[PDB]
Amino acid sequence: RNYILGLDIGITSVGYGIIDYETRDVIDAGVRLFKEANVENNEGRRSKRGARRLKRRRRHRIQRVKKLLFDYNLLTDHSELSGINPYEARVKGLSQKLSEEEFSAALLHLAKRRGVHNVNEVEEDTGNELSTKEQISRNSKALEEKYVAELQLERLKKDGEVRGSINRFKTSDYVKEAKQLLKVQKAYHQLDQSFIDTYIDLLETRRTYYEGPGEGSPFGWKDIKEWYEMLMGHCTYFPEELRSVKYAYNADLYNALNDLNNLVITRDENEKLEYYEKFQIIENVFKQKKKPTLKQIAKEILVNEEDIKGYRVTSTGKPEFTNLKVYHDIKDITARKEIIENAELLDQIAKILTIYQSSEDIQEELTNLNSELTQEEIEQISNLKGYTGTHNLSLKAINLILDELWHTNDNQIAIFNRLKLVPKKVDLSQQKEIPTTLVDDFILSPVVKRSFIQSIKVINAIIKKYGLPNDIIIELAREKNSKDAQKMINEMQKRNRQTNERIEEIIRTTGKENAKYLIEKIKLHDMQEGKCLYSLEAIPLEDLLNNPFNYEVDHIIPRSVSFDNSFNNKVLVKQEEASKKGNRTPFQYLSSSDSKISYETFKKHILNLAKGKGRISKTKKEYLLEERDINRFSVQKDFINRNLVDTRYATRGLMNLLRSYFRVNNLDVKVKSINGGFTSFLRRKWKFKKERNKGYKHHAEDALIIANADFIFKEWKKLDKAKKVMENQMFMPEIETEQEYKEIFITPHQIKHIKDFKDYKYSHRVDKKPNRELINDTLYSTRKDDKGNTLIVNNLNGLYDKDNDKLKKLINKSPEKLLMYHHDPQTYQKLKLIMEQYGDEKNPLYKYYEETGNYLTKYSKKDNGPVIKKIKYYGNKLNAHLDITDDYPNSRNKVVKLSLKPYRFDVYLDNGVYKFVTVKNLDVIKKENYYEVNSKAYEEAKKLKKISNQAEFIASFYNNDLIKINGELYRVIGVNNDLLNRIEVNMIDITYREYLENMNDKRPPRIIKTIASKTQSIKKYSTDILGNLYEVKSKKHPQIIKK
RNA sequence: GGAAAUUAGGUGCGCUUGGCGUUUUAGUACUCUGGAAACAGAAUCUACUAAAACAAGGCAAAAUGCCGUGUU
DNA sequence: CTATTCAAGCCAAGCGCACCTAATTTCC
DNA sequence: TTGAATAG
Ligand code: NA
Ligand code: NA
Ligand code: NA
Ligand code: NA
Ligand code: NA
């Protein structure tokens, strides 16, 4: 049957709506659900990847320095340097002699923390911030007479500490100390100039951004040329050709020639510049003046500036003409004709200056050119600035039409069209379905990319199961991500409180309880300063409250063409003004004789109302002062493109992808989009539940509303004009009044089919990806009690924070948990006194320090004890963990990491009893082209679960896999507790959190199921991308994961 | 709507670093014991400094060495 | 078992290219 | 949101 497809593309969801194109009856509707592909996910990976390289290279830097000391025999395996103080050694080495153990440790400490190199350039006024820029500037003034080690030693004696925010210095500052130290220590130890050069190098040398990682990395490159070429784009007309450097000579000549060919001169002779004219212009003002003006070109062609038009212009109004960058950059230092008049050479210099990133590399590459350049010239060209970026065309494209630009008057696009050169496009004829590879090409956000890919896959599945639809209407989220979404919600709620407080203010002042039914009119009243905007006459609030029917909410721009139902297109005016106005703009109405005031008097009031705090909306201003003609089709097109349809870049890209696919394969499918503001208006007037608490079905419900919107536009012949623009087809009946507009769209009783629908499907995206986060980062120390139990040791930092009552609750509930309670009890009593004194306050340590300005100090009979920055306390008993004690030699206690992230769990049926084996991410090992589950770890866990060889393997469960526990179907979150056989799940049509809120249930919003002897039945279900359920069957547990 | 250019702003991918943070051990301080002091012993709580480890781990061999939390 | 509790690495500096938005000129 | 321990 012929149907209409509606799509609600969201951050997390894709809702589809399938309704009959004639019967208007809902065929099917459901939601596809998935994780938000927000940028922070990949950012975490890249951040961790970078962190590993830093730690690796820092270590490798040290090992090389130790190797240097080994080869010069200042360090051995027997040589001990434990009790040596680097700060004491580095200071002593600047003046006196050092031991081979004392001098070596000084060099090692320098090599470890070598400081910054790039920030050091510019000073910054200390705005009391802890930024690197301000800190470097701060230390520089303190190092005006002292070396780094001297300053650190002073801080170590005076403040008792060195490490922290203040320990940020320039690399050159450390190097300046190192040289001085090496200069003093040179005579005492047998070293050469190779030793001092090598160490200083090692101390300061770091890879550049264009050098990248070493030889092995898949993120690396072999040279600067390969590096830049892979990054740069390709030509528009020659896809196989790499783009040209932005500031090549022929590139700017191409730019300049286009400027001259676009010029129009009003004179007796030709209006377009002749060849010889452009030649003279190029030679006399373009190759002579860096920034060509309109006067110079006018003086050259012997006309006035006023006769010249069609030139590019800046925001100021000043004419903009192409600057010959390379020409003037080289001319300013070399005026030789051998170089300047060599276009090919200037091209090559431009390429080298742009591709390579350092003066030294420029010099070498320019020298390899074997041109007529002097070495003094080359070393001078290598310091030129601004050579960055690419041209959108290749040199092949530029050189091809360069003669055409000289001798003709056609610009680049005219010539390319004449030469039958069409921009690169992707063919979709060999495609059996809508591709998903092209998505990342025209996308900007990772969130949108996933939502688009899923949306396409939904469409492909729909057209496979239901056939091709005639109409596809799509809506996209207004938010770019969930963080932006919450921000919108907060702003919404804030405005709601303000308006609600405003209403309560009125009902308490006037006593009129009518105010709660006049919110929109009251909101307009305050926004218009109590004045009818069409008559500029005062609107008494008391009269508005008593007689609201005398004041009408009018639409500024008629919705028949504007399709705007928002607050921005609404004004509170007197009923007379709204009647006389009719279907016109304020401009069209106030210009007529039907009005009481002039448009100019109106325009003045609006502009002053649009300025200042609490001003009118900016969109309201553009509406109230609309001076274009409504009946013009071009004007109507702009309103539809803004308020009715969605013309955002992402939307257009996807919409073009679909239209191009259907066009190429000759498939008669009409694709369109719709603004969310209009669908919200429909949902509002069609009387849907304002509180969206039904769960995921709202996405599918929205899609049905969107699909219904498409149906309305095909039914009415007055909407045929607007419907044609939505489908973007080339080219009449129309909506004439406000009343006609309401009759068409506001049809609550005609959409009862949607609300009665109770057959929604749901599809949750299953995550089977190996090698995600294996474990939490935090390292934990352990202790053993008298019972022989191993206990986890936790830290309690930030004791002096305002809203931190962790210590307060800890002492009140379990004082014995503190390690301070057992060891050093005198300090504990000192803390208890502070705790007992501020029991009313949230954080006793906060209120204490907020008054005395002093912190809690360790007990000392001389009142000189150290400050307490954090407190250790015993946590839970150690169980599931990762033992990494071996990384710490002679450690008295275990050192562990916690939270072993589960990959999946395999359910076994063992002698009428359901059991399962938990597969951890740590248990999945990567190989060259595939991931394998550790067979030793699997059998081990299979033994720790009392699984027998007789047991029957049921199924494996990953995240968002559908599991049916005792007749109840859930979706899998993951293994919550391996030892206790507890897995966490969630509901399918809704979140369990919201499910409890609707039921007003105060229980903790987590569903934990226990797989034990009481467990009766376990079945694995699954869905397609549409949400159609089906049961599965398997023979053995999957061990090989292809990735 | 599309082509090129100028300016301003924005997004992503990738690269290069900085100073922190967690943990162990050692030293010191703090606490306890003895002593006239020196110092020794105990404790490992609190702080400071150094060295080392920091997703499990896998390559690599004198290296500005390399991979391991993303997408599909 | 249910109901409850705890806690989970972080800031700052620079660079390359790709893409997008807005404004301006020409043409297709 | 989620590993996972813990009181009852
Ligand atoms: Na490329
Ligand atoms: Na550059
Ligand atoms: Na008038
Ligand atoms: Na950027
Ligand atoms: Na807890």
> Nearest nucleotide, C1' to the C-alpha of A814?
C5
Give distance CA A829 / C1' B33 (Å): 22
Measured distance CA(A776)–CA(A763) in Å, rounded: 30
Strand B contacted by A585 CB (< 7 A): no
Resolution (Å units): 2.6
> Nearest nucleotide, C1' to the C-alpha of A991?
D1
Measured distance CA(A24)–CA(A751) in Å, rounded: 9
Q: Which residues of chain A between 430 and 459 are close to nucleic strand C, CB under 7 A? A: 442, 444
Q: What share of chain A is helix, strand, coil (3-state, %, to 5)?
A: 45, 15, 40
Tokens for A702, please give them. 């929205």
- Strand A3-9 and strand A471-476: pairing? parallel
Q: Dihedral sign, CA of A593, A595, A601, A603? A: negative
Strand C contacted by A294 CB (< 7 A): no
Ligand nearest to the CA of A586: 3
The most distant pair of C-alpha atoms in chain A lies apart, rounded to whole Å, by: 109
Strand B contacted by A772 CB (< 7 A): yes
Residue nearest to nucleotide B10 (CA to C1'): A444
CB A673 within 8 A of CB A475: yes
- Which phi-psi region, left, alpha or beta, contains residue A911 (left: φ > 0; alpha: ψ -120 to 50)? left
Measured distance CA(A959)–CA(A477) in Å, rounded: 26
Q: Which bases of chain C come closer than 7 Å to a protein CB?
A: 1-10, 12-21, 23-28
Strand C contacted by A198 CB (< 7 A): no
Beta bridge mates, A932: A925, A1040
- Three-class HEC string of A389-405: CECCCCHHHHHHHHHHH
Tokens for A579, please give them. 């009647």
Protein residues closer than 7 Å by CB to strand D: A 876-877, 879-881, 898-902, 973-980, 984, 986, 993, 1006
Helix (H, G, I), strand (E, B) or coil at A655: helix
CB A365 within 8 A of CB A223: no
Whole-number Cα distances in Å, A906 to A658, A937, A958, A979, A983: 41, 14, 9, 14, 12
Q: Phi first, then psi: what are they for A473, rounded to 5°?
A: -115, 130
CB A907 within 8 A of CB A747: no
- Three-class HEC string of A265-276: ECCCCCCCCCHH
A964, amino acid identity: K
Annotated catalytic residues of A are: 8, 555
- Which phi-psi region, left, alpha or beta, contains residue A580 (left: φ > 0; alpha: ψ -120 to 50)? alpha
Measured distance CA(A324)–CA(A250) in Å, rounded: 9
C-alpha A244 to ligand 1 mean position (Å): 12
Measured distance CA(A548)–CA(A384) in Å, rounded: 72
Strand B contacted by A113 CB (< 7 A): yes
Ligand nearest to the CA of A355: 2
Q: Which of A680, A689, A682 is nearest to A742 (CA)?
A: A682
C-alpha A43 to ligand 2 mean position (Å): 26
Q: Which of A968, A900, A1016, A34 is nearest to A446 (CA)?
A: A34
C-alpha A793 to ligand 5 mean position (Å): 13
Q: Which of A12, A14, A37, A1027 is nearest to A474 (CA)?
A: A14
> Nearest nucleotide, C1' to the C-alpha of A890?
B25
Q: Which residues of chain A between 989 and 1018 are close to nucleic strand C, CB under 7 A? A: 1002-1004, 1006, 1008, 1010, 1012, 1014
C-alpha A236 to ligand 1 mean position (Å): 13
CB atoms within 10 A of CB A306: 9
Ligand nearest to the CA of A361: 2
CB A75 within 8 A of CB A189: no
Give distance CA A212 / C1' C12 (Å): 21
Strand B contacted by A42 CB (< 7 A): yes
C-alpha A424 to ligand 1 mean position (Å): 15
Strand C contacted by A882 CB (< 7 A): no
C-alpha A875 to ligand 5 mean position (Å): 8
CB A256 within 8 A of CB A321: yes
Binding-site positions of A:
8, 475, 479, 699, 780
- Please report how the helices A844-852 and A825-837 are oriented relative to each other, as an axis angle in degrees rounded to 10: 80
Helix (H, G, I), strand (E, B) or coil at A923: helix
Q: Phi first, then psi: what are they for A1029, rounded to 5°?
A: -75, 150
Strand C contacted by A944 CB (< 7 A): no
Residues A928-949: b if buried by 16+ CB within 10 A, e if exposed: eeebebbeebbeebbeebebee
Measured distance CA(A64)–CA(A951) in Å, rounded: 56
CB atoms within 10 A of CB A94: 17
Measured distance CA(A709)–CA(A701) in Å, rounded: 13
Strand C contacted by A138 CB (< 7 A): no
Give distance CA A861 / C1' B36 (Å): 21
Give distance CA A45 / C1' B62 (Å): 31
Sorted by sequence, the CB contacts under 8 Å of residue A283 that are 6+ apart come out as none
> Nearest nucleotide, C1' to the C-alpha of A789?
D5
Measured distance CA(A630)–CA(A625) in Å, rounded: 13
Q: How long is chain A?
A: 1043
Sorted by sequence, the CB contacts under 8 Å of residue A700 that are 6+ apart come out as A8, A15, A16, A17, A29, A30, A31, A760, A761
Rg (CA), chain A: 38
> Nearest nucleotide, C1' to the C-alpha of A390?
C17
Strand B contacted by A781 CB (< 7 A): yes
Q: Which bases of chain D come closer than 7 Å to a protein CB?
A: 1-6
Sorted by sequence, the CB contacts under 8 Å of residue A85 that are 6+ apart come out as none
Measured distance CA(A607)–CA(A622) in Å, rounded: 10
